[PDB]
Design a protein around this ligand. Structure first.
Ligand code: ZN
Lengths: 145, 49, 48, 254, 113, 44, 73, 87, 97, 254
């Protein structure tokens, strides 16, 4: 019942985030995520979207959203470290939509709603993205039958 | 046995996370606490050992 | 001014941003520079 | 000169910061004024608050009544620049209305992205021309003579980014077959940069494919001696691996 | 095949989001919340007579704004667990009783607090 | 918080019309205000 | 003296402080430690290309300063 | 709530505090001293090149050059893995 | 056994190939019953190309030298007039599941 | 002499550093300010700050009056040169208003680029003439009487560049069949520079091409024994390939 694909099911989960216009500035859906390695953002699109059919696991970057800025109070230790490595001029914050813990799936669809286009959006937000991840769950221990 | 219970890998890894970080630092599989946390979140095989 | 600073070691008028000179009364607004958790313990009152 | 559009306003940050209106230079002003202009520019027209601008220009110890100093710096910018190019939003300033190619940093970013795309596409001449255009942007050290911890951070970041640009450029030069100029300029750079290991590995692979061996291993021995004297550790294993594969006279590189 | 799938039931937490009105952890699987140690559980631990495990499950593993950080530091650095403090919910109870015009004051052996 | 020196403090004495006397801690570099709100009754 | 022998086997070739010729000749063959050169016999380093008798004499004096000797010597 | 201090963040900050002093002690005493007098650290306010040239008594160019040398030494990848992941 | 495939115009096993009545997951199910023998220890790429209406089966596949299919009657999919199927099935050797 | 424009200011750094106006040299003066002028000239118009100038010129330990000494050297050059050539920007000193082809290094680089383009286009004689004109601009030793460590680094860089230009001109001359002067030049430089192995490889190619064989093998044996005595590697695969092609009497090389 595992090898012959008898008791298995496709489970599709939708998960969304929206880039809004807060008081400090507009949230941006961008690829240039700060303080992260290049291999993490390898599967993102030019505008910061995970590609269709890209296998994704827990903790991975789905859509790259950065907050515009935050009250900055760098500690002298972090200031000295910043001098050695250098940091982004923007000083944006990592609030991108990640995969929840213990989730594995294949991205089967992304829906983007833009305020600049004809799409209608709730007040405040500038754009919105929804990602569907689909996993073919086989039968395992603890599954109730 | 009567005194045993079977915890899953992910659940036991999440419960014992700081102990796993300390042991990873002690067994020099991670340079520091941040690297140990990154290895625990990534879920490598040495973390499970 | 009554319930303590909502920030950490800051005050209302924007002056006294650092941590070094903690525990002082700002002359502009009266906000004592201290931790934000003081707002969990500091109360006021209403005169009827 | 082919992109000199009428009414186009050009800004220079990759070297000494400057303003150019249709070809004529503008008096930027005091070094702190120049650093404020650079801080407002590098955010790609994002609104920076006055307190954050103070933190970028001066750091941890500002004088008490010197918010009006930033106010008069912004007023002097609006004197020098257009009334509408610098806008005031939420108590801060933002340099808006900038077209494409106006900022040299954005031009360098686009040129580097195009070079990477042509590397992915395998085009050597096009990416070589793109990097030649990129290297003709900055003049001298970046952010010359400006104070501030933000200015220092941008200086060191852009210097490191220029270092990786030179590394990729000259790795491509060794890929295409430019021996002489690469050997000469990397000798100059490693004379300027004594402890940069990547440039010294580039010297090793360049001299291994250029017919010169004695000064290569002399530089390598000096590298190990200086790295042991100044740090007390061992160099990176890739350098030792490439030196070992050089020692066995592998014809793959030749 | 029922929809009580094991991939959705399983949830674990060592340290995650904490609630705001009281500083205990919040609840739920999606928000990385902790299991509830209700009143009957506390009765069971008193019936064992394990004062220390009950105290650390009530004061260390929740409801202490400074105990949790110190215990995490002690586990990471390998040293022994620090002594538990005072739960935050008791302080919130004292503050809410004080604003109902009740002069609820703690007393030590020598004097007040 | 380990090794930090507080800005020098002076306790300035304020007295209201109703007789309430209280001390407020200010910095040495700070400008002392002649007017304050009374902690006891809220008066001048 | 066992710790001293371990230290004399453990240090890299760069502390041996001889000329670049014999150093390059031994590093080409893959020898990077003093103990690796000690474990080799005499015919092992007289089979090295471009390794003259002056190189052997210089190496022998070098290890003679350190107090140890070759294999089968 | 966002004002709640994350235990992992505080542990990382304390480990950064312990590691930065160790990597400063890895360097020479004079270089570590001028770095700690130049970029915050021991003393909250960071004293400028001019403000330290009286207690130590050299030129602006010498102190600037040794500061640049310390920055280049700390930028070397050997003393980087102990602090790169600390951000 | 077949261990991986690649359908042209398909990025994941939850789409539908334009012009076949069976979705890609049903294609996975039909491929999983295809019994093969591979002499090569390394994986081998077999090719299945079909244009136009008809019934694509295991007899329509192209087995390389050393790799042989053994049930050519196994139906794989159906194609209408605008159907076009191109798969590159990777076959490997092993034991068990 | 055909490009001697009236009022044109030219500079020479390929040999002794000098300034010429209408064919008449200018009083450069002290070697220290000569080194400063060379440091400003060698950046190809890129701005240089005063501090980096001090670090390049005086090395690691400047005396207590470095900034004022650099300022008075710049002032002396301001009287010596045109006021509009030497400018002060962002606390640094730069050389502007430089005409095309006035600088010997820039002219040599342009001639080298034109020669490379002609070689890619097949025009060997035009490329040879252009780079011969470029090589005629070197006035003996590079940076004569120019102190400072940066002066040594620039001397090494320009000497390596000149040696590589001579090397490529030599191979072009061997391909053109003009081996008579090439043999003498190669022997003179190998006497001057035994360390270069590519130059000795081109010398061996000339020896095989011109028609004598045994003394060419003597030259190869000399290179092999020098390599064994000084450094000790086996001959490189390119050199061994050339040697075995020469021993097999390859008609393609002849
Ligand atoms: Zn205030």
């Amino acid at each position: 019942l595992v090898q012959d694909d008898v008791l298995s099911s496709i489970h599709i989960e939708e998960h969304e985030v929206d880039a809004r216009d807060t008081k400090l500035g507009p949230e941006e859906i961008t690829r240039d995520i700060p303080n992260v390695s290049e291999e993490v953002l390898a599967d993102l699109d030019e505008r910061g979207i995970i590609r269709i059919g890209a296998e994704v696991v827990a903790g991975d970057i789905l859509v790259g959203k950065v907050t515009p800025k935050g009250e900055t109070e760098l500690t002298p230790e972090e200031r000295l470290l910043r001098a050695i490595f250098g940091e982004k001029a923007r000083e944006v914050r990592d609030t991108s939509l990640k995969v929840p813990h213990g989730e594995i799936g294949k991205v089967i669809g992304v829906r983007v709603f833009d305020r600049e286009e004809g799409d209608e959006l709730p007040p405040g937000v500038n754009q919105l993205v929804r990602v569907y991840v689909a996993q073919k769950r086989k039968i395992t221990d603890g599954d109730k039958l | 046995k009567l005194h045993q219970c079977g915890l899953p890998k992910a659940m036991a890894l999440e419960l014992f996370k700081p102990f796993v970080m300390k042991r990873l630092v002690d067994l020099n599989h991670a340079q520091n606490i941040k690297s140990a946390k990154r290895m625990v979140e990534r879920g490598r095989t040495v973390v499970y050992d | 001014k009554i319930f303590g600073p909502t920030r950490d070691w800051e005050c209302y008028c924007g002056k006294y941003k650092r941590v070094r000179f903690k525990g002082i009364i700002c002359e502009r607004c009266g906000v004592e520079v201290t931790r934000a958790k003081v707002r969990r313990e500091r109360m006021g009152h209403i005169e009827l | 000169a082919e992109e000199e559009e009428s009414g186009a306003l050009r800004f220079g940050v990759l070297g000494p910061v400057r303003a150019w209106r249709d070809g004529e230079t503008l008096a930027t002003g005091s070094p702190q004024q120049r650093a404020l202009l650079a801080a407002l520019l590098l955010r790609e027209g994002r609104t920076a608050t006055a307190g954050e601008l103070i933190d970028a220009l001066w750091g941890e110890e500002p004088p008490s009544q010197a918010l009006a100093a930033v106010r008069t710096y912004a007023s002097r910018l609006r004197k020098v620049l257009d009334p509408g190019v610098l806008v005031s939003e939420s108590g801060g300033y933002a340099v808006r209305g900038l077209a494409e190619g106006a900022l040299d940093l954005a031009r360098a970013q686009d040129l580097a992205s195009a070079a990477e795309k042509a590397r992915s596409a395998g085009d050597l001449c096009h990416a070589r021309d793109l990097l030649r255009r990129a290297l003709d942007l900055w003049d001298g050290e970046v952010l010359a003579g400006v104070p501030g911890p933000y200015a220092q951070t941008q200086r060191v970041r852009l210097g490191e980014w220029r270092l990786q640009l030179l590394e990729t450029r000259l790795d491509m030069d060794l890929d295409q077959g430019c021996h002489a100029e690469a050997v000469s300029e990397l000798t100059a750079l490693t004379a300027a940069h004594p402890l940069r290991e990547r440039l010294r590995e580039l010297l090793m692979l360049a001299l291994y494919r250029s017919g010169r061996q004695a000064e290569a291993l002399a530089v390598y021995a000096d590298t190990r001696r200086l790295l042991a004297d100044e740090l007390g550790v061992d160099p990176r294993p890739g350098l030792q691996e490439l030196q070992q594969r050089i020692l066995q006279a592998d014809p793959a590189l030749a | 095949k029922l929809h009580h799938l094991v991939d959705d039931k399983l949830h674990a937490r060592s340290t995650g989001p904490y609630s705001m009105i009281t500083q205990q952890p919040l609840g739920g699987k999606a928000q990385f919340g902790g299991q509830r140690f209700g009143e009957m559980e506390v009765w069971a631990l008193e019936a064992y007579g394990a004062a220390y495990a009950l105290q650390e499950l009530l004061t260390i593993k929740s409801d202490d704004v400074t105990g949790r950080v110190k215990v995490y530091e002690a586990i990471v650095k390998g040293e022994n667990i620090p002594e538990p403090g005072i739960p935050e919910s008791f302080k919130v109870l004292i503050k809410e009783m004080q604003s109902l015009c009740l002069n609820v004051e703690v007393l030590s052996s020598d004097g007040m607090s | 918080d380990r090794g930090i020196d507080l800005a020098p403090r002076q306790a300035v004495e304020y007295a209201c019309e109703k007789g309430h006397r209280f001390e407020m801690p200010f910095s040495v570099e700070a400008e002392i205000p002649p007017e304050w709100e009374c902690k006891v009754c809220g008066a001048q | 003296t066992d710790a001293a022998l371990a230290a004399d086997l453990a240090l890299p070739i760069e502390e041996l402080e001889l000329t670049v010729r014999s150093y390059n000749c031994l590093k080409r063959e893959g020898i990077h430690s003093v103990g690796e050169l000690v474990a080799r016999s005499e015919a092992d380093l007289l089979d090295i290309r471009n390794f003259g008798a002056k190189s052997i004499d210089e190496v022998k004096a070098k290890l003679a300063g350190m107090g140890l000797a070759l294999k089968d010597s | 709530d966002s004002e709640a201090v994350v235990p992992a963040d505080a542990v990382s900050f304390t480990l950064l505090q312990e590691q930065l002093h160790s990597v400063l002690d890895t360097l020479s005493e004079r270089e570590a001293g001028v770095v700690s007098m130049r970029f915050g650290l021991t003393d909250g306010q960071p004293k400028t090149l001019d403000e330290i040239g009286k207690v130590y008594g050299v030129t602006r160019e010498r102190i600037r050059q040794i500061e640049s040398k310390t920055m280049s030494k700390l930028r070397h990848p050997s003393r980087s893995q102990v602090l790169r992941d600390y951000l | 056994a077949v261990t991986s495939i690649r359908i042209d115009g398909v990025l994941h096993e939850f789409t539908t190939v334009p012009g076949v009545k069976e979705d890609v997951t049903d294609l996975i199910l039909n491929i999983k019953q295809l019994v093969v023998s591979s002499e090569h220890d390394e994986p081998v790429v077999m090719y299945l190309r079909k244009q136009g209406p008809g019934l694509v089966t295991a007899a329509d596949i192209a087995p390389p030298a050393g790799v042989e299919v053994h049930n050519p009657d196994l139906v794989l999919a159906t194609l209408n007039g605008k159907g076009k199927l191109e798969m590159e099935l990777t076959v490997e050797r092993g034991r068990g599941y």
